[PDB]
Design an enzyme around this catalytic site. Structure first.
Site, PDB file in Angstrom:
ATOM      1  N   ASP A 135      -6.135   8.174  -0.171  1.00 47.61           N
ATOM      2  CA  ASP A 135      -5.703   7.115   0.714  1.00 47.61           C
ATOM      3  C   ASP A 135      -4.499   7.644   1.452  1.00 47.61           C
ATOM      4  O   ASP A 135      -3.651   8.310   0.862  1.00 47.61           O
ATOM      5  CB  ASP A 135      -5.296   5.910  -0.090  1.00 47.61           C
ATOM      6  CG  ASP A 135      -6.287   5.604  -1.141  1.00 47.61           C
ATOM      7  OD1 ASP A 135      -7.433   5.342  -0.760  1.00 47.61           O
ATOM      8  OD2 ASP A 135      -5.935   5.658  -2.333  1.00 47.61           O
ATOM      9  N   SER A 182     -11.472  10.734  -3.397  1.00 45.66           N
ATOM     10  CA  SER A 182     -10.982  10.470  -2.072  1.00 45.66           C
ATOM     11  C   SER A 182      -9.490  10.236  -2.164  1.00 45.66           C
ATOM     12  O   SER A 182      -8.910  10.115  -3.242  1.00 45.66           O
ATOM     13  CB  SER A 182     -11.678   9.265  -1.470  1.00 45.66           C
ATOM     14  OG  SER A 182     -11.417   8.105  -2.223  1.00 45.66           O
ATOM     15  N   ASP A 200     -12.348   8.594  -7.311  1.00 45.33           N
ATOM     16  CA  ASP A 200     -13.554   9.259  -6.848  1.00 45.33           C
ATOM     17  C   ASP A 200     -13.251  10.554  -6.117  1.00 45.33           C
ATOM     18  O   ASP A 200     -14.173  11.197  -5.614  1.00 45.33           O
ATOM     19  CB  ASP A 200     -14.371   8.334  -5.956  1.00 45.33           C
ATOM     20  CG  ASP A 200     -13.728   8.105  -4.626  1.00 45.33           C
ATOM     21  OD1 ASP A 200     -12.531   8.391  -4.487  1.00 45.33           O
ATOM     22  OD2 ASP A 200     -14.419   7.629  -3.717  1.00 45.33           O
ATOM     23  N   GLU A 223       0.822  -1.193   0.000  1.00 47.80           N
ATOM     24  CA  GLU A 223       0.000   0.000   0.000  1.00 47.80           C
ATOM     25  C   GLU A 223       0.859   1.247   0.000  1.00 47.80           C
ATOM     26  O   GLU A 223       0.573   2.195  -0.724  1.00 47.80           O
ATOM     27  CB  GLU A 223      -0.909   0.017   1.220  1.00 47.80           C
ATOM     28  CG  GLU A 223      -2.000  -0.992   1.161  1.00 47.80           C
ATOM     29  CD  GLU A 223      -3.002  -0.696   0.075  1.00 47.80           C
ATOM     30  OE1 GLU A 223      -2.804   0.253  -0.700  1.00 47.80           O
ATOM     31  OE2 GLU A 223      -3.969  -1.453  -0.031  1.00 47.80           O
ATOM     32  N   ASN A 272      -8.601   5.126   3.217  1.00 47.27           N
ATOM     33  CA  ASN A 272      -9.181   6.100   2.323  1.00 47.27           C
ATOM     34  C   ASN A 272     -10.125   7.023   3.068  1.00 47.27           C
ATOM     35  O   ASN A 272     -10.728   6.675   4.085  1.00 47.27           O
ATOM     36  CB  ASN A 272      -9.895   5.420   1.153  1.00 47.27           C
ATOM     37  CG  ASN A 272     -11.195   4.823   1.548  1.00 47.27           C
ATOM     38  OD1 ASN A 272     -12.125   5.534   1.867  1.00 47.27           O
ATOM     39  ND2 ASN A 272     -11.291   3.509   1.483  1.00 47.27           N
ATOM     40  N   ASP A 309     -14.897  -5.032   9.720  1.00 49.51           N
ATOM     41  CA  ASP A 309     -16.171  -4.570   9.203  1.00 49.51           C
ATOM     42  C   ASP A 309     -16.864  -5.613   8.359  1.00 49.51           C
ATOM     43  O   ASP A 309     -17.928  -5.329   7.812  1.00 49.51           O
ATOM     44  CB  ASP A 309     -16.028  -3.255   8.444  1.00 49.51           C
ATOM     45  CG  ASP A 309     -15.461  -3.420   7.054  1.00 49.51           C
ATOM     46  OD1 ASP A 309     -15.214  -4.561   6.604  1.00 49.51           O
ATOM     47  OD2 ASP A 309     -15.267  -2.370   6.398  1.00 49.51           O
ATOM     48  N   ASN A 329      -7.663   8.770  -5.188  1.00 42.68           N
ATOM     49  CA  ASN A 329      -8.477   7.780  -5.854  1.00 42.68           C
ATOM     50  C   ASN A 329      -9.300   8.457  -6.922  1.00 42.68           C
ATOM     51  O   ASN A 329      -9.479   9.673  -6.927  1.00 42.68           O
ATOM     52  CB  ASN A 329      -9.400   7.102  -4.855  1.00 42.68           C
ATOM     53  CG  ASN A 329      -8.641   6.429  -3.771  1.00 42.68           C
ATOM     54  OD1 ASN A 329      -7.653   5.764  -4.026  1.00 42.68           O
ATOM     55  ND2 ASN A 329      -9.083   6.604  -2.553  1.00 42.68           N
TER      56      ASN A 329
HETATM   57  C1  LIG Z   1      -8.954   0.287   3.623  1.00 39.44           C
HETATM   58  C2  LIG Z   1      -8.658   1.263   2.498  1.00 39.44           C
HETATM   59  O1  LIG Z   1      -8.925   2.408   2.602  1.00 39.44           O
HETATM   60  N1  LIG Z   1      -8.071   0.714   1.311  1.00 39.44           N
HETATM   61  C3  LIG Z   1      -7.757   1.545   0.195  1.00 39.44           C
HETATM   62  C4  LIG Z   1      -8.815   1.325  -0.868  1.00 39.44           C
HETATM   63  O2  LIG Z   1      -9.995   1.837  -0.379  1.00 39.44           O
HETATM   64  C5  LIG Z   1      -8.408   2.033  -2.152  1.00 39.44           C
HETATM   65  O3  LIG Z   1      -9.290   1.596  -3.119  1.00 39.44           O
HETATM   66  C6  LIG Z   1     -10.054   2.649  -3.624  1.00 39.44           C
HETATM   67  O4  LIG Z   1     -10.953   3.059  -2.654  1.00 39.44           O
HETATM   68  C7  LIG Z   1     -11.743   4.104  -3.153  1.00 39.44           C
HETATM   69  C8  LIG Z   1     -12.640   4.605  -2.034  1.00 39.44           C
HETATM   70  O5  LIG Z   1     -13.454   3.569  -1.562  1.00 39.44           O
HETATM   71  C9  LIG Z   1     -12.610   3.564  -4.277  1.00 39.44           C
HETATM   72  O6  LIG Z   1     -13.414   4.597  -4.759  1.00 39.44           O
HETATM   73  C10 LIG Z   1     -11.734   3.094  -5.412  1.00 39.44           C
HETATM   74  O7  LIG Z   1     -12.458   2.462  -6.423  1.00 39.44           O
HETATM   75  C11 LIG Z   1     -10.781   2.079  -4.826  1.00 39.44           C
HETATM   76  N2  LIG Z   1      -9.820   1.775  -5.844  1.00 39.44           N
HETATM   77  C12 LIG Z   1      -9.648   0.421  -6.274  1.00 39.44           C
HETATM   78  C13 LIG Z   1      -8.618   0.139  -7.353  1.00 39.44           C
HETATM   79  O8  LIG Z   1     -10.298  -0.438  -5.785  1.00 39.44           O
HETATM   80  C14 LIG Z   1      -7.016   1.560  -2.500  1.00 39.44           C
HETATM   81  C15 LIG Z   1      -6.570   2.358  -3.717  1.00 39.44           C
HETATM   82  O9  LIG Z   1      -5.330   1.849  -4.119  1.00 39.44           O
HETATM   83  O10 LIG Z   1      -6.144   1.823  -1.471  1.00 39.44           O
HETATM   84  C16 LIG Z   1      -6.372   1.141  -0.301  1.00 39.44           C
HETATM   85  O11 LIG Z   1      -6.350  -0.258  -0.522  1.00 39.44           O
HETATM   86 NA    NA Z   2      -3.989   1.639  -2.021  1.00 39.39          NA
END
Ligand SMILES: CC(=O)N[C@@H]1[C@@H](O)[C@H](O[C@@H]2O[C@H](CO)[C@@H](O)[C@H](O)[C@H]2NC(C)=O)[C@@H](CO)O[C@@H]1O
Ligand code: NA
Ligand SMILES: [Cl-]
Ligand SMILES: [Cl-]
Ligand SMILES: [Cl-]
Ligand SMILES: [Cl-]
Ligand SMILES: [Cl-]
Ligand code: NA
Length: 129
Positions: free
Chosen positions: A52, A50, A48, A35, A59, A101, A46
């Site tokens: 991370d 947001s 959207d 990560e 995120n 969760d 991201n």
């Molecule tokens: C627990 C956490 O926060 N994990 C991150 C993921 O949430 C991220 O994935 C991205 O999350 C956003 C917000 O929910 C989604 O909109 C987006 O689609 C999603 N991206 C993907 C490829 O699934 C992730 C991004 O690398 O980073 C952490 O794993």
């Molecule tokens: Na990530």
């Protein structure tokens, strides 16, 4: 802070992540590696809008407040900047909520894609824990 692998393993172990929700420590170290490359200051935006944050790339869509993810939740009840601290407590405590969760570590995309189903124990190999 950029943690060493074993340093982070030890920090995560001290913070109760070893076998937390059945996820051995290597899972968490593996997730952090992929990560954030063990960098507590990692941020990534991201699609959207947001972001991370931190060593576990938690995120702001769901877990923390960064003041610029409208309509998002802050389920860890923390400013996202807290997840960038060299002190991983906030990230760990939030990660514990996330992993609890119902979706386990699948919340961590990098974990799902790069750690899940691999020999994650390799990530804590050689570490004094
Ligand atoms: C627990 C956490 O926060 N994990 C991150 C993921 O949430 C991220 O994935 C991205 O999350 C956003 C917000 O929910 C989604 O909109 C987006 O689609 C999603 N991206 C993907 C490829 O699934 C992730 C991004 O690398 O980073 C952490 O794993
Ligand atoms: Na990530
Ligand atoms: Cl490394
Ligand atoms: Cl392990
Ligand atoms: Cl926001
Ligand atoms: Cl710490
Ligand atoms: Cl699970
Ligand atoms: Na948020």
């Amino acid at each position: 802070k950029v943690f060493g692998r074993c340093e982070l393993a030890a920090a995560m172990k001290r913070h109760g992540l070893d076998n937390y929700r059945g996820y051995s420590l290597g899972n968490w170290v593996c997730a952090a590696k992929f990560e954030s490359n063990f960098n507590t200051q990692a941020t990534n935006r991201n699609t959207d809008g947001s972001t991370d944050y931190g060593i576990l790339q938690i995120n702001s869509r769901w877990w923390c407040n960064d003041g610029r993810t409208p309509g998002s939740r802050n389920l860890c009840n923390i400013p996202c900047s807290a997840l960038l601290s060299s002190d991983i407590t906030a990230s760990v405590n939030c990660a514990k909520k996330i992993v609890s969760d119902g979706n386990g570590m699948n919340a961590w995309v990098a974990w799902r894609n790069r750690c899940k189903g691999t020999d994650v124990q390799a990530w804590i190999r050689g570490c004094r824990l």
